[PDB]
Amino acid sequence: VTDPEALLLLPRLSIQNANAISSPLTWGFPSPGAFTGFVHALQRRVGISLDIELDGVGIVCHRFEAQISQPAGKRTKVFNLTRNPLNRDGSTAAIVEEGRAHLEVSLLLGVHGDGLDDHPAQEIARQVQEQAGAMRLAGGSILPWCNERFPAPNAELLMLGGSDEQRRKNQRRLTRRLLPGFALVSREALLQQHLETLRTTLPEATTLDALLDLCRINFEPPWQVRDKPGWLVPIPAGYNALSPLYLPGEVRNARDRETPLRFVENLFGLGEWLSPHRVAALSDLLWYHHAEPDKGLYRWSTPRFV
Amino acid sequence: PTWQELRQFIESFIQERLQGKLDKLQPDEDDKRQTLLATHRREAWLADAARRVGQLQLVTHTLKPIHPDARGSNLHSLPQAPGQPGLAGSHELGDRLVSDVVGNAAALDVFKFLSLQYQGKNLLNWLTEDSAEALQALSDNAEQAREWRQAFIGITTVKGAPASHSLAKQLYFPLPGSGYHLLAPLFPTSLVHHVHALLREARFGDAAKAAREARSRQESWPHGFSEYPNLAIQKFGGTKPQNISQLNNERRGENWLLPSLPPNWQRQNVNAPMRHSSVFEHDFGRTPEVSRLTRTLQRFLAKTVHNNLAIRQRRAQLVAQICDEALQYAARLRELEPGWSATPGCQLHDAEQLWLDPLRAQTDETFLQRRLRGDWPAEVGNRFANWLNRAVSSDSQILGSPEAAQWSQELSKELTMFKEILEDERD
Amino acid sequence: ILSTASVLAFERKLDPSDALMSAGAWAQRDASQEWPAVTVREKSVRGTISNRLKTKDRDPAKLDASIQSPNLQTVDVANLPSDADTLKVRFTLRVLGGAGTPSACNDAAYRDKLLQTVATYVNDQGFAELARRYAHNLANARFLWRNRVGAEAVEVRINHIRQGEVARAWRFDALAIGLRDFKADAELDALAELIASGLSGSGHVLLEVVAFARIGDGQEVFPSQELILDKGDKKGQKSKTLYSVRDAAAIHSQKIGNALRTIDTWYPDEDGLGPIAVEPYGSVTSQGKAYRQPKQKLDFYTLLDNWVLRDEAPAVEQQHYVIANLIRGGVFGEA
Amino acid sequence: ILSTASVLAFERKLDPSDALMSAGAWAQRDASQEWPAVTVREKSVRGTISNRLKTKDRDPAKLDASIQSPNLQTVDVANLPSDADTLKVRFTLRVLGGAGTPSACNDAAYRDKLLQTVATYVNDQGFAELARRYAHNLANARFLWRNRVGAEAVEVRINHIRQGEVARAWRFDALAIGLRDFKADAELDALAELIASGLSGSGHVLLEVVAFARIGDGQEVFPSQELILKGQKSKTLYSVRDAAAIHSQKIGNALRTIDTWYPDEDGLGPIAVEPYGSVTSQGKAYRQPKQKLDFYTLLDNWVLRDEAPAVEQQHYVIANLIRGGVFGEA
Amino acid sequence: TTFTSIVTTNPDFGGFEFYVEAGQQFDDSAYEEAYGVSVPSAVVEEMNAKAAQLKDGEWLNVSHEA
């Protein structure tokens, strides 16, 4: 929402069992809500001590390996599970299917505040890396890079540049540093205009049909595949209200009795895995929160993408 | 719209239930027909059915797919539409709600009774709008009719205080000012059933199987078809998917998740050229994706002008994706493998000098690093332009027209940005 | 009245990674950074049937016709190469810290009571009995699960990875240290104080646990096996899938954690098993039997409720079990 | 009442490796560490019809029409080179020990009774009859399955591998030691004592079994064959890393051909130790459960109700426990 | 095909489980209508003997594991 004064780069973090189930309709890379909740956890744990405000994540995903397996004779896939403990009686517990995946992402945390001036850049970069080393990103532990070739350090890029050329130089230097991955942005205006063209073709078509049409490899007869611009994916773009907002000590069995609970439901927007130098400014492509809590509509996106 | 036809329709449903019970009774003695015709025939069937409603619940967002030892709250609530454009889910269903049932499966006759389609709509939807046709048929006294109507309407209400079990999910959300909201999400099962119906119609439907066979005939069909690759199946009940919900009997588990995958979700291993034949076959090292991308550029030859505008924007996008995949191939080859400085030979295409960035500088300090920083090897783009001239054919309908000018200008600006990205490998 | 918090959840302390297994030769274990990874490859197996016939298939005709239609499987195997007799199993371990602070708790009164209880434990008897046993399951290579049963010599090397480098390096003989005796050893005590200072402070202590098992040339090593329901049709069915991280066999993270948690020798049943895993209603998956039943007053929930709510402090062994269940993590709470 | 456990998982003792095969010349078998491996290569074959017709294909018109269009295939063959006549099949055998202890069991009483039963077996008579037969199946090269049937002279070298070096090296003539008679030698009894000490848990036994089979110049050798998913690829051969190999369970099945106690005639000789003791080639299941001599009724009579069988049948039962398996009902 | 049974005092009405009321009888028609599978006729008398032998306020949970 606001512009970051600096752009921190947490380097390639190895996540071993992330959540492959991003949403009820999407499997694969975990939801960007996990990464925005991670940067809010980082702000809640060391952001208040350094007098900075870590907002926004650029999700890069150098490596992804889902713990899946294609069954024999089926085109679809199934998830490799774990073995839960037995019950108190000795029988096998009722299995619940949780998708696990191995990640390697690097995060662009947009850091703005009055703590960039108090501390050096390398100190606050090192302290948020040490705080991220004892955390988890989507349910999966962050592997801490022991006894390898060399440890990947951080770089807090002060985005306030003296010139346009030095700014473009350090943006290119950072893009070369997070290069083999694929930045994730939220392209929802493309989904809405594809819904507009779909409704032009056939009326009363809703945007779930436009989302599914942007998802699949659909064929057209003269046979030619309808082309897709980029790697468009369905992503859960936040939540939506189902119940009115309850009081803190009102709902039963909540997490805490001091925070208002509201029953919610996902909102599957459209995302687009694009390469990091297709953006020409890394102060875009960061994932912020947008709540508007009177209406529901607790959503996350990349504002200022285009 | 009159109460007499609704009355006789309800009596016909009750009598069909009793006739099915008597036909599947296999009785000859014990006089159970008297008790069955006293209970399951009269308007006391409405009485014990209205007693049975509190065992059921019409739901749209169940909890039980989240870990099935969870006794929380299940909601039949449709969200309001976001004013923000783009994103949507489960509020698009206006007249296509499938409307799951949770609760005691022994009381499913109440839901089958409220789901009869008597005039033009459900009996339940007749009971929500209090009319003359409603609340006159299901009794002769309006007091117990009002009581049974209030019972039947309660099939879509939350029973008890709102709750979410310790095994359920509930997630803090940072508000703009301060504070959080707990946000316990519920599994949208009517939306999952709708997307599951769309996916089953597009995969196993007859109108898609016909076009799929017409593709194998190589003939012409009116409509096309979809494919939906990389779907993952998630079943909710382990061995008993009956114990989750109503529609989880129809889709036996089987959530059918769409793929949200990054493009490097298939690990490609790295290979550097060793010998002269390896340097002739591995100078390019062309992945399946760039061949899939150049085959699309090969299908972008012919054009009419109003289509050639979008075709030129698509050709610019494809050359951008090819150049960017070349940049990522150079990136992962220069970073992952030390094989560019593994062995010496006679032919390794040493004019490239881009896929061996740390290989010739971090070991040789003044030998090749002084031949890469002052020379700044960026002549790889001129050799890379030969690949994209091989991607296009010899079509003279564009070579003797202004399409070659637009092609050359987009190629020049794209090799310009490829050159300035390739220029500063030294920093 | 201080009723039980309806939501309890503890974050997993002692969080290991996948145990990547790579192969090579003994007497160059000190140069083991370029050892090639043990790859998971397929092989085909024919079997004649051997399951117990259910007294209706004991006809000679049906059995003879069933040994002429054999089952044709495709199993995954992980073998050492023909010129390698040593298995380097290498994983990382974060000993996180904050072992009594729950990850989710409803009641602030229950939360403060539980934190006062765990602080009473840590002040009276800190993590020195638990961490000795975690250091033993690191020291003897119990995390080498079936790769230990006939190894010639197992040697475990543990490095306290500091900021970027090895701060303190251990080297154990994992066959001299048994699988059922938690004795006291000086280097094991130093590792126990390191895991103690990891479990007490707010920062994580990172170890690198490398174990070498001299199995033999070309022999089979045993990585973890993936739980795949719906294998598919029986034609191309792969009946056994071994876990591989990236063309490299590995034991799962929860399997290494299950071998590290095998410290519980305090259960009321006799110790024919010796130590079992720290579980609530402490249950052994291989035995198919849940010890520490709720019928006796010795499971984790009743010991925790008597310790926190009504101040009945259990025995020192049972509160070792309770705090080891807190370090293990979990999801608890009533409706 | 001591019913049988619902899981009984026995580990595989006598754990072999994939039998790699190389190639070289005889009389330099002693310097056979650098011999080139027998690579599996492809070749096309052309088959005519030779199967039994099903009384409707006996019309000469369709017979000649199907002969006129014969089936092409692409088999995998592994032959010795044209200058080599000896096949060096080299595997390692690790003898584990702890034969009667199951890896998984529900009942503690049944597990204890099984441990007492195997323990009173071992105390009454060690693993001396079993290890003599395992040592014979190592000495006579039955693990050379079809590479033995026409070999001129087979020689098996078995080395006890200690720390990294050879503790005691054997050298047998695999054709003098027959395929069906279990005689007694001095070196075979020393190998039997070594495998006995391996199975009793009183030592670590890692043998490296090398077997040279003088087949002939350029002849065909037979590794194990994979299952198959114009160029129909009718035979896919096993290969570990560009080197033909025999499967580990094939070598284990050849080592377990010690069972000469099956109730039928002993004209066939030893068969493989299996419950419902069966040979998949001959298609006949000896020790059918009608007769009281399969593994399951013998174990359930020896452990549950203490009807101890004869010495031969309990040798067979402990040979099945050394083999390992998935026993126990549902 | 394995029709288990458990007497529950409080039922789990959040899922689609089959609970028989204490003062009622098993209904094979309702089980064949709710779930797709039909009850075999040898399970019915066992479920009747369990459903009749029920204290007031004790539900009979009937489920198959096919």
Numbering used by the authors:
A (entry chain B): 3 to 224, 239 to 322
B (entry chain A): 8 to 434
C (entry chain I): 24 to 358
D (entry chain H): 24 to 252, 258 to 358
E (entry chain J): 18 to 83
What is the paper's account of this structure, in its own sentences?
First, AcrIF7 binds to the DNA vise in the N-terminal domain of Cas8f and mimics the PAM duplex of target DNA. D44 and E50 interact with K28 and R24, respectively, mimicking the phosphate groups of C(–2) and C(–1) of the non-target strand of target DNA. In addition, S80 of AcrIF7 hydrogen bonds with N250 of Cas8f, while Y36 and V37 of AcrIF7 hydrogen bond with N111 of Cas8f. Consistent with this hypothesis, EMSAs showed that AcrIF7 effectively blocks target dsDNA binding to the Csy complex. Interestingly, AcrIF7 and AcrIF14 can interact with Csy simultaneously, reminiscent to AcrIF2 and AcrIF1 which were shown to bind Csy simultaneously.
The Csy complex is composed of four Cas proteins including Cas5f, Cas6f, Cas7f and Cas8f in a stoichiometry of 1:1:6:1, and a 60-nt crRNA that integrates all these protein subunits. Consistent with previously reported structures, the Csy complex adopts a helically twisted ‘G’ shape with Cas5f, Cas6f, Cas7f and Cas8f protein components integrated by the crRNA.
